[PDB]
Structure 1
Amino acid sequence: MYHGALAQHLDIAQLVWYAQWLVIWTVVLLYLRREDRREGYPLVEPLGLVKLAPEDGQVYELPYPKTFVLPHGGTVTVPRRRPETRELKLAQTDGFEGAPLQPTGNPLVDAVGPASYAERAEVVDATVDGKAKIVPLRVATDFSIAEGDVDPRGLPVVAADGVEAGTVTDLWVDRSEHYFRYLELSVAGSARTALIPLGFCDVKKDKIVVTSILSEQFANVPRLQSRDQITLREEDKVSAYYAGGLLYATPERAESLL
């Protein structure tokens, strides 16, 4: 006789094999793949006209809503209805369903393609204890550059075309994580300030190189509402602007490299 034998050529290990697959597919299909759908759902078709009743699969693929209690007041529930309101300055290059769109205007200002920003809250990101998280050093006076590292304040900013475009006046720091996220710079010849994500900055000891945009394009970087704080949507607008330059700053950057 055998430990683990059952009647008619079954054994326990054989059953557990089936059970294990059942557990896996249950968690993956009925749990994880629905969690995956708490954003961007329900999907968008060539006009979903049936306003009278929902299609069955759209209800089945969604999880029950969850509510986040925000740390400084408010609640967010996902999933939820969030259509993109703003007019997009794009035109269909063809009649095909998945043909690409073309920018009709200037895609950096129009904020399309890689220049697109998400419609986040017009809200300032906050520290544990309520202060503004992302602040320039003139405000965050107990924060310093670490000894060892370039102080960029005073250095010029060189754009993709090699032209000096402005001068770094300040660093914005994340007070929650102790990490610099933007440089502030005056754009020469325009009597205004612009913010730059550090990730677009090549910090050299005599200059800040910036390959994403041209010098002239520093004029139309999204401006902030206030001088000394930034909203989450503004952070998106600013970051997106330079990323759009990777594909759009010159006509040649959108075409094939070969």
Structure 2
Amino acid sequence: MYHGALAQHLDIAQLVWYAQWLVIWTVVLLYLRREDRREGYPLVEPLGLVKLAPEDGQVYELPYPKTFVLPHGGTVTVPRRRPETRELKLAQTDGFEGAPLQPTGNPLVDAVGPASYAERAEVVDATVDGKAKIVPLRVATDFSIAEGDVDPRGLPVVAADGVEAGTVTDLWVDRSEHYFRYLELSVAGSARTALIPLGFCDVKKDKIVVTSILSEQFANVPRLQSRDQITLREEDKVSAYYAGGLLYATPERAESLL
């Protein structure tokens, strides 16, 4: 006679096994996976045949909507229907479902592929007080660089060519993270400051090296609306431009190695 024996071959351990499984899958499927479809669903179709319903099992799929009450007023409902209405300057190679696309004009200005941004809300990012979160060091006068680092203010910005694009005007700080996000440089040749994300420049002792894009295309980095604060959308715009240059600066960046 044994502890935990339900028959001559059936024991409580064995049953628990399945039980365990059951739960795992249930959570995974009937929960986690639903939670995953809060963004970008339901699926869209630009070739296939009369479909208002993804992989099948799934048009329930989408969970019922949440309602994020936001810190500084307002509500967001998730999932949503946020429509893309920018008119993309992309021609298709083939009309085919999953055949890739060719940019028609300048991809960096027409904002497609790695140079595309998301249409974020056109508002300034804020602190817990209600100040602007991301500001330059002309504004956040209280903030400073840690003693022992290189102040990049004054240095030459060298682009992909090996050509000086201009000179560093300022740093921009995140006020709620104590972290530097942007270099504001003065694009030489024009009368303009352009903002580069700090993740696109290797800061040295003497120079700032910018591999991303060529010297000539610093002239076309998206213009800021205000002088001293940046909206959420403007951020995406600025970032996307340089990253797009990682595929579109020179013609050879397209191509495979052979």
Question: TM-score when scaled to structure 1?
Answer: 0.95
Q: Give the Å deviation of 1:83.
A: 1.6
Q: Deviations over 1:75-124 (max 9, x none)?
A: 11110111211100001101221000110010101110000001111111
Q: Secondary structure at the match of 1:58?
A: coil
Distance 2:17 2:55 in 1: 37
* Structure 2 counterpart of 1:10: 10
Q: Secondary structure at the match of 1:121?
A: coil
Q: Is the 8 A contact 2:53 2:59 kept in 1?
A: no
Q: Is the 8 A contact 1:126 1:132 kept in 2?
A: yes
Q: Is the 8 A contact 1:42 1:58 kept in 2?
A: no
Distance 2:38 2:239 in 1: 25
RMSD: 1.9
Q: Secondary structure at the match of 1:222?
A: coil
Query: Using a 3 Å threshold, how does the CA distance of structure 1 residues 113 and 235 change in structure 2: closer, same or farther?
Result: same
Distance 2:52 2:26 in 1: 32
Query: Using a 3 Å threshold, how does the CA distance of structure 1 residues 228 and 79 change in structure 2: closer, same or farther?
Result: same
Alignment length (residue pairs): 258
Q: Give the Å deviation of 1:46.
A: 1.9
Distance 1:73 1:51 in 2: 38
Q: Give the Å deviation of 1:9.
A: 2.0
Q: Secondary structure at the match of 2:19?
A: helix
Seq. identity, %:
100
Q: Deviations over 1:183-241 (max 9, x none)?
A: 00110011011000000011001110000000010011011100000011110000000
Q: Is the 8 A contact 2:4 2:13 kept in 1?
A: yes
Q: Secondary structure at the match of 1:168?
A: strand
Q: Give the Å deviation of 1:4.
A: 0.6
Q: Secondary structure at the match of 1:126?
A: coil
Q: Give the Å deviation of 1:58.
A: 5.2
Q: Give the Å deviation of 1:65.
A: 0.9
Unaligned runs of 5+ in 1: none
Question: TM-score when scaled to structure 2?
Answer: 0.95
Q: Secondary structure at the match of 2:95?
A: coil
Q: Give the Å deviation of 1:47.
A: 6.6
